[PDB]
């Protein structure tokens, strides 16, 4: 009945080891010398994670298999097999990592089939707007090299996308509670954060967390208790109260 989290650091190395073992045992080779049951090997592995029904012990096991690709070759045999097996995928891009997107999670090539029921209402109420904004900003990122587009609405997309990127950035080994993620995503989506400088957004979110620890115990407790967004007017009141004190630098 307990819940287990399992992480495999590299499936590709298991695949390589099994390939070597099969070839040494003189079994018939296959596509890239992989043995005939390499797909069955990983299906056996990743199919044992499940969420048990009520009639059985209500435990569950969850897995995060890892795949290592060379030069972004997502068309290789093992990566394709694992993508076929798994319920989702998230794609970390080294170019985005170097350009400053620290989590490097590409929202375009990352999909989760369970996404939806796997969230709480507070985050579900705000996730769609952020996804839509980032998707729109993806195309517009190719125009920022030109100094100006002669309508504010299109440049507003660039500004909002930059602010989104700055909000989503994070540092090592400092995870955030889901309620404090919900609050900051709400602040970004409702335009409270739109008037803040890009270099200042990163400091702004931490100062906002401090202000929450000061005077938002009721909001945080309500989110934790009901998995739902608090009173919209009271939340706006708190956010504007913080903005009354935060100073642009």
């Amino acid at each position: 009945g307990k819940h287990v989290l399992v992480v495999y650091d590299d499936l590709s190395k298991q695949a390589a080891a099994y390939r070597e073992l099969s070839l040494l045992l003189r079994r018939p080779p296959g596509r890239e010398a992989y043995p005939g049951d390499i797909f069955y090997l990983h299906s056996r592995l990743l199919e044992r994670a499940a969420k048990l029904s009520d009639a059985k012990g209500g435990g569950s096991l969850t897995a995060l298999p890892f795949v290592e690709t060379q030069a972004g070759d997502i068309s290789a045999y093992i990566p394709t097999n694992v993508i076929s097996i798994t319920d989702g995928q998230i794609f970390l891009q080294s170019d985005l990592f170097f350009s400053g997107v620290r989590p490097a999670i590409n929202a375009g090539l990352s999909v989760s089939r369970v996404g939806g029921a796997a969230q709480i209402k507070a985050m579900k109420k705000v996730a769609g707007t952020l996804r839509l904004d980032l998707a729109a900003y993806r195309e517009l990122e190719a125009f920022a090299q030109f100094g100006s587009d002669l309508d504010k609405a299109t440049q507003a997309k660039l500004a909002r996308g930059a602010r989104t990127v700055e909000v989503l950035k994070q540092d090592l080994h400092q995870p955030i509670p889901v309620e404090k993620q919900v609050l900051i995503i709400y602040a970004l989506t409702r335009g409270f954060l739109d008037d803040i400088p890009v270099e200042d957004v990163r400091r702004f979110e931490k100062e906002f967390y401090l202000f929450l620890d000061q005077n938002g115990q009721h909001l945080l407790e309500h989110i934790r208790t009901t998995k739902d967004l608090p009173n919209e007017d009271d939340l706006n009141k708190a956010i504007e109260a913080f903005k009354k004190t935060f100073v642009v630098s």
């Binding site: 080779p29 890239e32 010398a33 060379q70 030069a71 090299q145």
Partner: protein, 240 residues
């Protein structure tokens, strides 16, 4: 050679260097001998035991409580693509990669080290220093912006777009040319003596060039000169 290094790090606890030149030949020889040994071939004609063969060698070069071995070892990349299994499998064992790049080497820009692909997990603010980390990330950023200008100026020209273009381009190329240092070994190819620059002087000169203390200095003064005082001296010599 590894056994000779191991004796020193185990029997006396010294700090030993191990320079292995073109380790790719080790796996290539393994691939040559595996076929004759009677083993069935592998994906790109390599040996089935490539991964374990590399790992048995590599995992012995590790620091212990008594001593510590550090190793600088080159990688040969066939056909100049990093997708081949022999260079691909060795990535997992490395803590710092210095990616020399062609189309940088082609201009004679030695040591052809790419400021972009060069990575090392030692670059962290709490280990190298906050100012060093800030300077390194700043120079990486200002070098990043320049490459995107190259395509748009290929289709239009350098002077087509002027949105802070003078400032950003100047900042980028002055650092890019400044990264190239004259080596002591390079006497065999140019005669000119090399120079040694410490880390404090490096970060200080980079702070100056970043803030614009030397915005009007020539580009060639940054190339293959070493310290910033040497840069300004040679620029004064050439530029009157």
């Amino acid at each position: 050679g590894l056994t000779m290094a191991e004796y020193f790090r185990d029997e006396q606890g010294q700090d030993v260097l191990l320079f292995i030149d073109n380790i790719f030949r080790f796996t290539q020889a393994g691939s040559e001998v595996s076929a004759l040994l009677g083993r069935m071939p592998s994906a790109v004609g390599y040996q089935p035991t490539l991964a374990t063969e590399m790992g048995q060698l590599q995992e012995r070069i590790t620091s212990t409580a008594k001593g510590s071995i550090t190793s600088i070892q080159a990688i040969y990349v066939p056909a100049d693509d990093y997708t081949d299994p022999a260079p691909a499998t060795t990535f997992s064992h490395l803590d710092a990669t210095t990616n020399l790049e062609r189309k940088l080497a082609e201009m004679g820009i030695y040591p052809a080290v790419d400021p972009l692909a060069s990575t090392s997990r030692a670059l962290a603010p709490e280990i190298v220093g906050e100012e060093h980390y800030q300077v390194a990330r700043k120079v990486q950023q200002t070098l990043q912006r320049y490459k995107e200008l190259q395509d748009i100026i290929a289709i239009l020209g350098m002077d087509e777009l002027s949105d802070e273009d003078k400032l950003v381009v100047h900042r980028a190329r002055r650092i890019q040319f400044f990264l190239s240092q004259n080596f002591h070994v390079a006497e065999q190819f140019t005669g000119q003596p090399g120079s040694y620059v410490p880390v404090k002087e490096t970060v200080r000169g980079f702070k100056e060039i970043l803030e614009g203390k030397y915005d009007h200095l020539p580009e060639d003064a940054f190339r293959l000169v070493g310290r910033i005082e040497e840069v300004v001296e040679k620029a004064k010599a050439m530029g009157v």
